[PDB]
Amino acid sequence: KITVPTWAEINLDNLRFNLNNIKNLLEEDIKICGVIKADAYGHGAVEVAKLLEKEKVDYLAVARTAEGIELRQNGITLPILNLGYTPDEAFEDSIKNKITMTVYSLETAQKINEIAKSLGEKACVHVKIDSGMTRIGFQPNEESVQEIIELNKLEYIDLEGMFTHFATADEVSKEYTYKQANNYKFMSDKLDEAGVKIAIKHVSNSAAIMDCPDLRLNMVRAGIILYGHYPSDDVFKDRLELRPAMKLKSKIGHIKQETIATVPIGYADGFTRIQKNPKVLIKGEVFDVVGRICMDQIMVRIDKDIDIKVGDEVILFGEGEVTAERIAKDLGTINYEVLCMISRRVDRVYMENNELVQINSYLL
Amino acid sequence: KITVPTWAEINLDNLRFNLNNIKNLLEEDIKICGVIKADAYGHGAVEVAKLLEKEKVDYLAVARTAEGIELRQNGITLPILNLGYTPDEAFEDSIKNKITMTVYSLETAQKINEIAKSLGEKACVHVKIDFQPNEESVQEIIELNKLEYIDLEGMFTHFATADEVSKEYTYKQANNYKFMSDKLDEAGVKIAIKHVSNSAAIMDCPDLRLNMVRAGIILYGHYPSDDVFKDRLELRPAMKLKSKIGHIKQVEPGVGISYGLKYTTTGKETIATVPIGYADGFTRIQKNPKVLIKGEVFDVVGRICMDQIMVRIDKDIDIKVGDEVILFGEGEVTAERIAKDLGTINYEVLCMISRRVDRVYMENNELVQINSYLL
Ligand SMILES: Cc1ncc(COP(=O)(O)O)c(CN[C@@H]2CONC2=O)c1O
Numbered sequence: 001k002i003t004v005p006t007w008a009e010i011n012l013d014n015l016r017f018n019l020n021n022i023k024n025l026l027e028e029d030i031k032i033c034g035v036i037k038a039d040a041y042g043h044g045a046v047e048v049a050k051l052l053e054k055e056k057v058d059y060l061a062v063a064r065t066a067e068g069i070e071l072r073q074n075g076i077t078l079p080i081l082n083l084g085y086t087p088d089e090a091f092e093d094s095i096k097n098k099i100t101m102t103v104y105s106l107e108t109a110q111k112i113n114e115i116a117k118s119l120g121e122k123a124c125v126h127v128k129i130d131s132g133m134t135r136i137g138f139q140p141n142e143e144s145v146q147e148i149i150e151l152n153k154l155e156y157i158d159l160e161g162m163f164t165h166f167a168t169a170d171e172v173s174k175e176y177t178y179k180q181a182n183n184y185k186f187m188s189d190k191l192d193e194a195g196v197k198i199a200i201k202h203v204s205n206s207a208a209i210m211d212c213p214d215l216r217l218n219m220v221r222a223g224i225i226l227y228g229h230y231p232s233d234d235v236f237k238d239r240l241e242l243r244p245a246m247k248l249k250s251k252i253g254h255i256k257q258e259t260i261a262t263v264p265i266g267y268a269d270g271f272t273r274i275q276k277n278p279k280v281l282i283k284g285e286v287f288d289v290v291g292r293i294c295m296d297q298i299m300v301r302i303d304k305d306i307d308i309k310v311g312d313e314v315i316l317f318g319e320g321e322v323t324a325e326r327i328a329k330d331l332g333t334i335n336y337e338v339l340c341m342i343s344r345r346v347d348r349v350y351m352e353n354n355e356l357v358q359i360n361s362y363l364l
Numbered sequence: 365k366i367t368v369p370t371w372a373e374i375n376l377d378n379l380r381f382n383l384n385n386i387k388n389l390l391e392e393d394i395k396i397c398g399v400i401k402a403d404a405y406g407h408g409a410v411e412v413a414k415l416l417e418k419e420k421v422d423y424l425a426v427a428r429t430a431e432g433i434e435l436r437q438n439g440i441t442l443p444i445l446n447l448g449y450t451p452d453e454a455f456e457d458s459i460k461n462k463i464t465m466t467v468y469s470l471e472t473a474q475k476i477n478e479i480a481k482s483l484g485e486k487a488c489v490h491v492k493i494d495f496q497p498n499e500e501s502v503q504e505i506i507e508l509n510k511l512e513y514i515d516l517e518g519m520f521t522h523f524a525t526a527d528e529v530s531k532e533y534t535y536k537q538a539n540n541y542k543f544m545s546d547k548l549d550e551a552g553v554k555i556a557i558k559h560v561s562n563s564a565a566i567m568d569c570p571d572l573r574l575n576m577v578r579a580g581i582i583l584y585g586h587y588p589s590d591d592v593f594k595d596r597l598e599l600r601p602a603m604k605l606k607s608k609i610g611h612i613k614q615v616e617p618g619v620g621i622s623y624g625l626k627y628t629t630t631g632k633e634t635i636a637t638v639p640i641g642y643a644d645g646f647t648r649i650q651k652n653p654k655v656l657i658k659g660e661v662f663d664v665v666g667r668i669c670m671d672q673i674m675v676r677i678d679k680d681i682d683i684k685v686g687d688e689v690i691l692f693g694e695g696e697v698t699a700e701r702i703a704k705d706l707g708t709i710n711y712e713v714l715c716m717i718s719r720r721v722d723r724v725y726m727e728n729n730e731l732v733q734i735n736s737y738l739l
């Protein structure tokens with residue numbers, strides 16, 4: 001069944017476990033947006049979306065029009081929100097495929113409106129508020145409020161939602177986070193007061209869902225925690241029990257007498273050469289990767305008395321002491337990036353009840 | 365029509381230039397193997413293969429059965445050599461798709477042979493030498509050569525240090541190969557294709573041509589190191605990683621930017637947000653990330669996010685949303701620069717370009733083709 005030497009194993013059971021533990025945090029009326037941008041953080045957006053439609057979630061979020069359309073082309077019917085920039089070249093496609101667009105200027109809204117009029121159907125949009133991230137969004141001021149009342153009047157636009165995003169909600173002190181929330185509440189209250197109707201207000205990411213049970217509003221945005229990982233070591237982990245879903249695996253391709261094992265995974269699979277202390281798990285024991293990581297393979301020193309043969313399974317992360325977090329720490333980056341590094345040629349294989357149920361090649 | 369906010373622009377003209385300058389190094393009868401593993405080092409294996417069939421090259425090389433089969437599924441007819449490991453689970457598919465397999469041992473050759481027998485057609489194989497270069501290996505090879513449903517077509521080794529200043533070790537490896545080559549010549553064994561040279565060797569070692577050379581990094585317009593003889597071979601990089609300015613704003617003094625608010629403004633600043641992030645392969649690890657906009661270099665500020673970055677515009681330029689941003693492949697922003705910042709190599713920076721980044725191909729300064737790996 002598996003014909004590639006190196007694959008990403010995704011445990012669908014663990015995803016369900018994570019989602020259900022997330023849902024147990026939430027009250028009945030609070031909506032869940034499943035964040036599945038960057039191919040569901042490396043796990044496979046189409047498949048993870050299929051699971052989310054089954055488990056019933058209220059919205060899907062992506063980072064790009066094309067990620068949105070890929071989901072549509074694969075049968076997905078859930079509302080999809082592009083969280084970021086939509087270039088003008090992609091408005092038509094967004095509207096035709098019912099992808100909800102993030103909007104953060106009146107100019108953008110007006111051009112979208114012309115296209116939606118042109119096509120003779122409404123564009124659904126969510127307004128972004130820059131509450132403290134300084135990334136995307138309207139500033140939280142009197143000027144933005146009027147610009148929003150204005151864009152709300154554009155026939156051929158359904159101003160459905162409004163959101164902001166926290167820059168430091170995974171840190172110990174939530175001061176800045178609540179400072180951001182207040183900037184949002186400013187816009188929320190002024191628009192409430194201006195008779196502008198916004199069905200979906202949302203602000204909470206994974207960190208906020210966990211640590212800030214007062215920031216639920218109409219909906220929350222669950223990303224990293226869906227996949228079985230914490231946004232940091234500083235969040236209240238005891239609130240939510242998680243199982244990581246991804247195991248990055250290869251096979252022992254060669255053995256040689258030190259005993260050196262050659263494994264057919266390299267930096268072009270996302271096992272980055274930058275790692276200063278690369279390690280692997282084999283038959284429950286951790287071993288050093290030795291010499292430079294190559295494009296398509298690495299050499300590992302077996303310095304323990306284990307019976308090991310060509311074909312035996314190697315785990316790069318997702319089990320025992322070899323974790324995406326460990327690699328991230330070695331890199332000086334974050335688990336998010338390690339997950340997203342898994343490259344195109346790495347087949348995603350999905351497990352369920354300990355059976356392989358599906359294998360996706362991104363080449364064939 | 366480009367509809368993605370972030371793309372990898374591949375200049376086909378430059379690829380042709382590189383290949384032709386490579387061909388000018390080579391004598392009439394020496395074959396070229398175009399190394400296009402890892403999706404042609406991020407440039408697009410299918411398209412680069414199409415170009416190579418057009419420009420005529422002898423052979424294609426890949427790192428994985430599936431890379432080989434992807435090329436076949438897209439009409440490619442050139443010989444393809446899997447340079448790396450073929451698991452037993454993939455022998456059948458290799459043979460059925462005429463993917464030439466690298467072999468290291470008699471035992472592997474014999475199993476392949478059974479499958480080829482089973483399928484009633486020959487497997488094409490190339491022998492790899494570290495097969496120790498001793499008398500034992502030479503008989504083992506004369507043995508495998510006999511096996512009926514295998515075509516022992518070629519034999520090769522690969523240099524570990526040919527891009528360094530001193531090749532001593534390289535010529536040490538070459539000798540070990542020449543031992544095997546001469547003993548098999550002397551036995552009855554044919555070997556139509558003997559090859560050893562990678563990009564570094566093609567450049568610095570004009571005596572290691574044999575029947576064929578393996579051109580990789582150089583094809584794409586990059587040098588395997590700073591130590592090779594660059595003056596022998598003029599290269600034009602083929603790839604430009606680009607995005608668009610997605611948002612632009614004037615930010616007050618002392619305001620934090622991005623996760624952890626690790627950059628705070630030091631006066632009023634113009635901040636451009638660009639829709640490229642670490643999940644497009646613009647790694648967050650970079651300590652000094654930069655971008656080129658309207659010919660000027662700018663600092664990326666605050667943490668690089670999954671899907672976007674913040675850029676301080678501190679020069680009097682006229683920039684509007686939609687304007688073009690270059691992450692590398694032009695002027696001072698190069699894959700090599702990023703590699704050096706990271707403590708890795710240009711090879712890795714090229715290969716980091718992720719699936720969602722559309723490859724768009726240019727030719728005479730016109731867009732001729734756009735490939736989405738999502739749609
Ligand atoms: C607008 C927005 N909402 C929700 C999320 C989900 O966050 P969690 O995954 O922490 O729940 C992200 C993630 N943005 C990624 C996370 O890291 N860097 C980024 O840009 C985001 O940009």
Ligand SMILES: Cc1ncc(COP(=O)(O)O)c(CN[C@@H]2CONC2=O)c1O
Nearest residue numbers: 294295447522562563578579580581588
């Ligand atoms: C067997 C073999 N031959 C030829 C090449 C071509 O190398 P150049 O790109 O230098 O021409 C490679 C690339 N191997 C890559 C280069 O860096 N690390 C690797 O594992 C290879 O593995």
